[PDB]
């Protein structure tokens, strides 16, 4: 009865273990901080509980007396995947496994 749909059962196994890898292995989100700066790894532990994040840029002094500021930047980045296309694919697999087996 299922002899003719074993290949779709395989494909649905492979798809779902792919999504389970994506979940395991990538970090949900991280606080990205760029630019020339000093971060004390003891102070970083306050990251959960601080209210203000202050970035003071490195000031570069030129031999002719000029002064100019480095580009600091900071903000959250978060992982994302194509939910629309992968779920439409897995819904097609489930639907077809059921269709060909009545």
């Amino acid at each position: 009865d299922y002899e003719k749909v074993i290949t779709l059962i395989d494909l649905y196994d492979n798809a779902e273990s792919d999504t389970a890898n994506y979940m395991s292995d990538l970090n949900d989100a991280m606080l990205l901080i760029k630019g020339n700066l000093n971060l004390d790894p003891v102070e970083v532990r306050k990251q959960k509980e601080a209210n203000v994040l202050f970035l003071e840029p490195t000031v570069y002094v030129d031999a002719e007396g000029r002064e100019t500021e480095g580009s600091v930047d900071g903000g959250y980045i978060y992982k994302q995947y194509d939910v629309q296309g992968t779920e439409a694919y897995k819904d097609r697999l489930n639907s077809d496994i059921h269709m060909f087996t009545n």
Partner: peptide, 12 residues
């Protein structure tokens, strides 16, 4: 004569 002063990131 001033010299290059490195920046700081602080969380308060």
């Amino acid at each position: 004569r001033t010299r290059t002063k490195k920046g700081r990131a602080v969380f308060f």
